Design a protein around this ligand. Sequence first.
Ligand code: HEM
Ligand SMILES: *[C@@H]1O[C@H](CO)[C@@H](O)[C@H](O)[C@H]1NC(C)=O
Ligand SMILES: *[C@@H]1O[C@H](CO)[C@@H](O)[C@H](O)[C@@H]1O
Ligand SMILES: *[C@H]1O[C@H](CO)[C@@H](O)[C@H](O)[C@@H]1O
Ligand SMILES: [Ca+2]
Ligand SMILES: [Ca+2]
Length: 339
Amino acid sequence: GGGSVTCPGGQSTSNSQCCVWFDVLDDLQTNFYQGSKCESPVRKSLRIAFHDAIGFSPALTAAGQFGGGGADGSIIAHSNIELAFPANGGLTDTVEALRAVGINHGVSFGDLIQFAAAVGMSNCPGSPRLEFLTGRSNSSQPSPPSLIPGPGNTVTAILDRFGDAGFSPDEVVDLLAAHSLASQEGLNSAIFRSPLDSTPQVFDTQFYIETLLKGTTQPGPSLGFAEELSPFPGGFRIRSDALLARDSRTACRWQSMTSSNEVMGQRFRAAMAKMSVLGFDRNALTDCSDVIPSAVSNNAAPVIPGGLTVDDIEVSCPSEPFPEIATASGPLPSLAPAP
Ligand code: HEM
Ligand SMILES: *[C@@H]1O[C@H](CO)[C@@H](O)[C@H](O)[C@H]1NC(C)=O
Ligand SMILES: *[C@@H]1O[C@H](CO)[C@@H](O)[C@H](O)[C@@H]1O
Ligand SMILES: *[C@H]1O[C@H](CO)[C@@H](O)[C@H](O)[C@@H]1O
Ligand SMILES: [Ca+2]
Ligand SMILES: [Ca+2]
């Protein structure tokens, strides 16, 4: 009930509580995203959205311990503690930028983190319009350690961690679609911002396709932590991604994610919707999704690049034949570092 309202700025929204977010939106797009760009800040933001929310463990709670508050913005309010975690390196600068936006505009760290991620993705072509709820308390307790899955973890360990959090193997695969807009800076400092897929600025299925290709080249002088050979020069491949793409428990869902950008988009949206509210009752929050702008549509079709073919794909789903995917001519492409 209530009805649509008009904000002070003339914008139309579903609830009055959404109005303050239009100010944050202008701030982020203007400053943080340096003109609504899809570069490092967007990737850092998405990474932070995950690392804040994932600090939620029903298992710890069942053992009589604090299991973490989930998407409570603890990674910021307790950055001194959480940024010490193995998986939270290279986030400090982004955390400080977000801390200031939240403090000034007066929005909670929890809400802001999920907001920034949704807004950031709208700057990258092909991205779906993520759900955005507001109303998370700004208060939090530091996240317990060892709750973030690591690149060197076995699939069994990764599935267990996510399972505890509330995600099925299929959902973990869906969640990894975020690596379609990713690079690494801390695994191998020798090759700064080496992309995970051939399109670090396009939310597409390229990540799922290329991760299944045979690893043939080494991007840098030496291998970094949890690094595997990749298919293209300049490209990077995380061990956990390589394993998940080929493990019988996740192989078919991963393969199903290669030919359809639309299917990928909603799967990621649904999985993200659940992650963004870990540690909260979504019914206690307010839906402000209409604040999130739409992104440019991706008209490029999925493809096996560089002259490689299905024969270069290490098909891991025994029950389904690899989908029909276009191929290309020209040589093997050299991937430039993500912007
Ligand atoms: C299942 C396990 C997952 C593992 C082991 C994992 C691991 C990693 C690692 C080691 C990096 C490189 C960090 C660096 O050295 O700069 C990375 C990057 C990234 N990850 Fe994941 N990740 C996982 C899931 C996710 C999820 C669920 C999301 C968000 C919805 C996400 C979003 C990102 C983004 C956007 C980057 C790129 C950062 C950049 O370009 O700066 N990841 N991830
Ligand atoms: C949220 O908490 C931080 C300290 O953890 C504080 O600096 C900030 O002003 C708070 N934000 C709001 C909206 O009260
Ligand atoms: C991709 O394109 C190349 C060159 O046309 C073929 O060799 C391959 O079979 C696939 O069609
Ligand atoms: C091919 O060229 C790109 C830059 O255009 C590099 O990033 C890659 O490592 C390889 O030298
Ligand atoms: Ca948290
Ligand atoms: Ca991509």
